[model samples]
Target chain A: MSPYGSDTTPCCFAYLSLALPRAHVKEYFYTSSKCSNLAVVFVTRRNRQVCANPEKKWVQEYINYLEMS
Target chain B: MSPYGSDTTPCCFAYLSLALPRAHVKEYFYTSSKCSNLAVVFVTRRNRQVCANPEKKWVQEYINYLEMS
Candidate 1:
């Protein structure tokens, strides 16, 4: 069970990988499996304000992502 | 005399032209030229909030254009 609830499954994670400068190598990390550690670049949140319209929520999320990016 | 004032000149007009479906040709218009009709798609406004910075004004114009498109 996760913090949300027992029915909660792990949400999808999206990320981007960028090359680092020589002095910034320490800023990057790698897992034991040798895969580079990734950071959350975007996420979708359910908007409870309106009726449960998934499409609207997705559009809002996309706008939010673009703004943040 | 123009609506704005003697100093007012017509601003630039940007638009897109698209082909219409059959039977809708009457909706198109050409002003003495063979070019198709176009619509006003975007405009920029001068902001009184901050100092007269042209870059910021261009950014606002870009966002407005994206929204309208």
Candidate 2:
């Protein structure tokens, strides 16, 4: 089964510069375009979620890092 | 703050015909395009998450329903 829960947690807004360890990040995805706040959400190991600014460099890096992991 | 979790829970695959009460749904968003499975996730009242087939009629209806609420 996928690590994801049954539903999405909406990220109405995101952190522009938040950073977390690559190992701690388990998965990530973008909020729907319909949302007022577009974000790249990162799911951590403990099932905690982190909403990051999609336009930021760190967010892109994290997405890439997790993709290859 | 958004009702979303800190990170995204990847829906590697989603349910084709799952249905839940409108009142139970708290929020929703789309999985990133980069994901293996493309889905519309619905967040419930207790923070439970549900990943549904984006192509389904119910999913679209729910999205619209939640949007107007």
Candidate 3:
């Protein structure tokens, strides 16, 4: 069953345009469909949950990099 | 802005009760408030995203463990 964290809305509103270094990444999670855009939540070394667009080249590359680890 | 990944729902539908060994965890992320419950998404060494209740003592312990790394 789908649950709402706050309001009946998506988890992300805007996607980050910058690509973070793969080495600085700790992990990632796909945004819930309730979000407005398709994004990959990239967990940084500092533990910040960043929302990034999944279609971006660097994003895909980063996912690949993390997947290899 | 809060974004959703798929449908208008929370990130975690249910929470995992088992406590994973601290050594097996690579990272963790807090579930979006849009979830039905407050949860900590624990990333394992194998990269499985396990949804865990944040209120549990073990969960808080794990968070502290990761915070030190």
User: How well does each candidate superpose onto the true structure, as a TM-score?
Assistant: 0.14, 0.44, 0.43
Models sorted by DockQ, best on top: 2, 3, 1
Off by over 4 Å in 2: A1-69, B1-9
Instruction: Mark the 10 consecutive residues where model 1 chain B has the least summed lDDT.
Output: B4-13
Question: DockQ of candidates 1 onward, in order?
Answer: 0.01, 0.21, 0.07
Instruction: Please list the residue runs of candidate 3 whose C-alpha ends up more than 4 Å from where it truly belongs after superposition.
Output: A1-69, B1-10, B13-17
Candidate 1 CA-lDDT value: 0.23
Q: Each predicted model: what fraction of the native A–B Cα contacts (within 8 Å) does it retain?
A: 0.00, 0.41, 0.09
Best by lDDT: 2
* Model 1 CA lDDT for position A7: 15
- What's model 1's interface RMSD, roughly to a tenth of an angstrom? 25.8
**Selected candidate, larger lDDT, 2 vs 3:** 2
User: Taking the tens digit of each residue's C-alpha lDDT, what string does model 3 give over B7-47?
Assistant: 22336534445676889889877777756567777777877
Q: Which lDDT values do the candidates have, in the order given?
A: 0.23, 0.70, 0.65
Model 3 chain B worst lDDT window (10 residues): B1-10
lDDT of 1 by residue, B1-69 (tens): 312111111121123222122222112111211112211212222111111112234334433444554
- Model 3 Cα RMSD, 1 decimal: 11.8
Clashes per model (N, Cα, C within 3 A): 0, 10, 28
lDDT of 1 at B1: 34
Candidate 2 per-residue C-alpha lDDT over A1-69 given as tens digits, one digit per residue, 9 for 90 to 100: 544444443543556554777887798877765455578878778777777876889988888887887
DockQ of 1: 0.01
Model 1 bad stretches (over 4 Å): A1-55, B1-69
